[PDB]
C-alpha cells in the first residue's frame, strides 16, 4: 500500500555493513532510551527477530547536518510561550527542560497552574514551577511515527497491540473500491500526498480534459500539461497500482491539490480498508480464538476484493547444441491446448489460463539419444518421428489462474539491451481478481487480526431491528485480555459517525459538550470525523454523542445510550436475550492470503547433492519434518511411521520408485532401505 512505500523510507535500521548484526545484537541496544522521544517512534518496530533494531523517524523529526536527529520545540521565555520554533538534538534536550503540549496555555503564552509536567535530563518526570520551563513540545503525537499516527484512539491501546496494528497497517492490499474511513486521524491526508502515489496538481489552473488515461490541465499562463496515469501497473509484491482521476472537465484546481487518487486513496486521503458493520458477540464458535466471520455480502458486492497481478518471464537464450525458438511447433501436445497461443508463440491477450496451461511456446534442441526399444516400436506404430527438439515451454505454475493483461516482448532483432547469449525475452502479466474467502487474514487498526473462519450467507447473520445484517462478527474474549479497547471506542464513534448526531443545544450547551469545537453539535449521516492521536474523543464526549444519534428513516434509535443493540438471530429467529455491541469498524485485508500459502506435494523435484525433496512452494516442495517432530514421534513410540518419513519419502532413491509402483499397482509398501543421507555421511567420513 502507499503507506508501506512511505514507511519503508523514513526507516532507521541499526543493522548492516558497519553496524551490529542480530547475533551480535545485545538486549540493551533494543530498548527505548528516554532520548527517543520525538526522534524515533517507540511503537513501530518489526515484531520478529528485529525488535528495536529497526524503527522509524518521528513525524516532526529532522536530521542534523552531522547525522544527528533534531526535533522542534516551542521556546518559552519567562513563562510566555513564544512561537520561535528551535530544533534541538538530544544533547540540548538534556541541558534544557521540556514541558507538555497538553498544558493549560491561557491564550497569551502564559501557563495557568504553576505546577507543571516536565522532563529532566536523565528521563526523570517531575513538577517544576511555571518559571523554569524554557522549552515546550510543539504538539502531542510528536513521539509517534507516521503509520502509528494513523491509529485512532491510540492512547487507549496497549503498546503490544499498538505495535501489531502499526506493523499490519502497512500490509493492507489495494482493493477495487478503496472507500475512505469514517473515523480516522489527521494523517490520512498527508500520508498519501507525500507517499507519491497520488498525482498532485503542480501549478494551479483549470481542467482542460480528463479521461481514464491522462489529465490535461490548463495553467493560468498559456501552458498546458498532461499528467499520465499508471493503470494496472504491477507493484513489487503483485498488487494493483491503479490511478483514476477524481476531477471533472470544468473544475478549477490549485497548486498542491490532489488530482487523481492512487492505489489506496479516496478523494485525497488514505483508504487501506473498508467500513464494515461489526458486532462483538461470540457466535456459534466460528469466531473462536481470533477467528472472524464475514457476511457473504462482502463477496457479493466485492467489498474486500483485490486485483493481484503476477509477472512471468522466459528468455530464449543460446546453447551448445544450437539456439532455441519461441514458436508454435511444439512436440507432443494436442492442438486443443494450442488454441490460446497466437501465431508466433505467446498467448493472446485476455485468454483466461488455468494451472499448467501453456503461456510461451518455446522449444529447445536435444541432440541424439538412443531410444528405448518400446518407444521405437510405439513411435513406428503411429508413424510419428523422433522430433529431436525438446520442449521447455513457460507453463504457468500450479495453483494459479486469471486473465492476461499485457505481454511485453523484447528481441535481439529490435536491438534491445539483452544480456550475453540471449536472443528473445518475453514477460506475461497474469492477473486474478482475488475475492475474500475463508482463510484470508483480516485486521483492524488496533492489533486485532484473524483468519476468516466462515463466510455465512446473508440470511443466517444477526440483523438489527431494521433488517440490516451485520457484516462481520468479532469475538469478545479477545478484547479485555489484550487491552486494546480502542477497537471498542472506534466502534462506538463509528456508529456515531454513521447515523449522525445532533446535540440539541436548546437551553445552553450540555456539560459534556462545553469544550467541543463548533460545527460538531450536529452532524450528517456518513459524515467523516477525525480524532488526532493523543487528543481525540474523550470518553464523556463519546457518551454524549452516543446519547443523541438521530434515527435512520423511521422513528427508530437502534443503538441506545449504552452503545448496544437488540440483534435478531438470523439463523434460529429468536432475538438474543441481551443487547449486543454494534458499530461501524474500519478493517483492512492483509497480504497473507490463502492462495499464497496453500501447498501440497505427493512427488516432485529433488535436491542436488543430497537426494532430499526440494522446498519453498516455488517448486512443488515439501515440509521440513525436523528434529523436534522426530522427538515427538519417538515419544509416541511411532517407529514405522518415523522410518517411513525418514527413509522412503526423502532419501531412499531406489525405494521411492518402489513405493510409487506399489501404490499404483495396489501392492504393499516395500520395506525401507538405508537412506541417501547416511551414505553421504559415510562417504564424507571416509
Amino acid at each position: 500500500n502507499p503507506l508501506s512505500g512511505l514507511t519503508h523510507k523514513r526507516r532507521l535500521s541499526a543493522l548492516g555493513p558497519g553496524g551490529l548484526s542480530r547475533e551480535r545484537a545485545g538486549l540493551e541496544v533494543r530498548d527505548v532510551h528516554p532520548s527517543h522521544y520525538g526522534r524515533m517512534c517507540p511503537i513501530e518496530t518489526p515484531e520478529g527477530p528485529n525488535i528495536g533494531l529497526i524503527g522509524s523517524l518521528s513525524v516532526y523529526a529532522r536530521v542534523n547536518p552531522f547525522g544527528f536527529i533534531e526535533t522542534p520545540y516551542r521556546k518559552v521565555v519567562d513563562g510566555v510561550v513564544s512561537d520561535e520554533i528551535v530544533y534541538l538534538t538530544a544533547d540540548e534536550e538534556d541541558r534544557h527542560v521540556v514541558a507538555q503540549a497538553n498544558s493549560p496555555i491561557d491564550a497569551d503564552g502564559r501557563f495557568v497552574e504553576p505546577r507543571v509536567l516536565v522532563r529532566r535530563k536523565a528521563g526523570e518526570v517531575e513538577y517544576v514551577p511555571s518559571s523554569e520551563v524554557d522549552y515546550m513540545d510543539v504538539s502531542p503525537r510528536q513521539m509517534v511515527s507516521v503509520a502509528t499516527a494513523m491509529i485512532p484512539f491510540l492512547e487507549h491501546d496497549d503498546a503490544n497491540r499498538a505495535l501489531m496494528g502499526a506493523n499490519m497497517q502497512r500490509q493492507a492490499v489495494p482493493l477495487v473500491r478503496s472507500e475512505a474511513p469514517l473515523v480516522g486521524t489527521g494523517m490520512e491526508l498527508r500520508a498519501a500526498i507525500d507517499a507519491g502515489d497520488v498525482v498532485v496538481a503542480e501549478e494551479s489552473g483549470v481542467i482542460e480534459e480528463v479521461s481514464a488515461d491522462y489529465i490535461t490541465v490548463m495553467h493560468d499562463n498559456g501552458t498546458r500539461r498532461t499528467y499520465r496515469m499508471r493503470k494496472f501497473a504491477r507493484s513489487n509484491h503483485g498488487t494493483c497500482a491503479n490511478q483514476c482521476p477524481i476531477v471533472d472537465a470544468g473544475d478549477r484546481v490549485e497548486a498542491g491539490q490532489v488530482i487523481a487518487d492512487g492505489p489506496c486513496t479516496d478523494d485525497g486521503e488514505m483508504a487501506l480498508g473498508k467500513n464494515l458493520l461489526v458486532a462483538i458477540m461470540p457466535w456459534e464458535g466460528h469466531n473462536y480464538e481470533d477467528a472472524i466471520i464475514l457476511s457473504n455480502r462482502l463477496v457479493e458486492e466485492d467489498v474486500l476484493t483485490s486485483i493481484h497481478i503476477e509477472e512471468h518471464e522466459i528468455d530464449a537464450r543460446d546453447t551448445k547444441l544450437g539456439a532455441e525458438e519461441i514458436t508454435r511447433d511444439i512436440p507432443n501436445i494436442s492442438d486443443e491446448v494450442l488454441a490460446d497461443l497466437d501465431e508466433r508463440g505467446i498467448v493472446r491477450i485476455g485468454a483466461e489460463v488455468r494451472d499448467g496451461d501453456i503461456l510461451v511456446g518455446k522449444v529447445t534442441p536435444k541432440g541424439e539419444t538412443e531410444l528405448t526399444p518400446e518407444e521405437r516400436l510405439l513411435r513406428a506404430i503411429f508413424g510419428e518421428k523422433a522430433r529431436e527438439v525438446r520442449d521447455t515451454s513457460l507453463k504457468v505454475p500450479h495453483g494459479e489462474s486469471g486473465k492476461v493483461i499485457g505481454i511485453r516482448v523484447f528481441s535481439r532483432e529490435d536491438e534491445d539491451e539483452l544480456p550475453a547469449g540471449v536472443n528473445e525475452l518475453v514477460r506475461v502479466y497474469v492477473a486474478q481478481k482475488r475475492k475474500i474467502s475463508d482463510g484470508d487474514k483480516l485486521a483492524g487498526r488496533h492489533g486485532n487480526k484473524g483468519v476468516i473462519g466462515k463466510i455465512l450467507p446473508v440470511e443466517d447473520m444477526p440483523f438489527l431491528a431494521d433488517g440490516t445484517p451485520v457484516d462481520i462478527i468479532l469475538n469478545t474474549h479477545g478484547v479485555p485480555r489484550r487491552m486494546n479497547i480502542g477497537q471498542i471506542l472506534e466502534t462506538h464513534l463509528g456508529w456515531c459517525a454513521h447515523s449522525g448526531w445532533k446535540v440539541d443545544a436548546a437551553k445552553g450547551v450540555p456539560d459534556w459538550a462545553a469544550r467541543l469545537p463548533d460545527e460538531l453539535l450536529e452532524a450528517q449521516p456518513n459524515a467523516i470525523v477525525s480524532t488526532p492521536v493523543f487528543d481525540g474523543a474523550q470518553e464523556a464526549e463519546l457518551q454524549g454523542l452516543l446519547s443523541c444519534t438521530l434515527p435512520n428513516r423511521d422513528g427508530d434509535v437502534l443503538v441506545d445510550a449504552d452503545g448496544k443493540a437488540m440483534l435478531f438471530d438470523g439463523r434460529s429467529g429468536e432475538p438474543f436475550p441481551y443487547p449486543v455491541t454494534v458499530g461501524y469498524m474500519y478493517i483492512m485485508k492483509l497480504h497473507h492470503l490463502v492462495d499464497d500459502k496453500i501447498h501440497a506435494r505427493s512427488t516432485g523435484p529433488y535436491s542436488m547433492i543430497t537426494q532430499q525433496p526440494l522446498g519453498g512452494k516455488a517448486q512443488f516442495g515439501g515440509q521440513r519434518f525436523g528434529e523436534m517432530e522426530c522427538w515427538a514421534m519417538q515419544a509416541y513410540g511411532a517407529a514405522y511411521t518415523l522410518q517411513e518419513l525418514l527413509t522412503i519419502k526423502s532419501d531412499d532413491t531406489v525405494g521411492r520408485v518402489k513405493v510409487y509402483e506399489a501404490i499404483v499397482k495396489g501392492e504393499n509398501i516395500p520395506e525401507p532401505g538405508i537412506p541417501e543421507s547416511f551414505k553421504v555421511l559415510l562417504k564424507e567420513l571416509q
Partner: protein, 90 residues
C-alpha cells in the same frame, strides 16, 4: 535449491513398466511368430534390433517376406483396438 533433471521422477518408472506389460500383452494378442519378428526387429528381448539378414538367418528365410510381415503386423496395430490401450502412452 537446484532440481535434478537426471533423476527418477517416479511416475516415469511405473508408467514405463505399465507400458512394457501392456505392449507385451498386445504383442501376444497378435499373430504367432510375426509379432515376434516385430519384437526382434525393434529388439524387445535381445536389446539390439538386428537386420533382415539376421532374422532370416535365425528363421531360415528371406528378407522380402520379413518386410511383408512387418507391414502386415504394422497395419493391424494402427487399428483402434490395439491402439486404444496404447495411444495414451505416446
Amino acid at each position: 535449491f537446484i532440481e535434478d533433471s537426471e533423476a527418477v521422477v517416479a511416475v516415469d518408472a511405473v508408467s514405463f513398466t505399465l507400458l512394457q506389460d501392456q505392449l507385451q500383452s498386445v504383442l501376444d494378442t497378435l499373430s504367432e511368430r510375426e509379432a515376434g519378428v516385430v519384437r526382434l526387429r525393434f529388439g524387445l528381448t535381445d536389446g539390439q534390433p538386428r537386420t533382415l539378414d539376421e532374422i532370416g538367418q535365425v528363421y531360415g528365410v528371406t528378407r522380402e517376406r520379413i518386410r511383408q510381415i512387418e507391414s502386415k503386423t504394422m497395419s493391424k496395430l494402427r487399428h483402434p483396438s490395439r491402439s486404444q490401450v496404447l495411444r495414451d502412452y505416446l
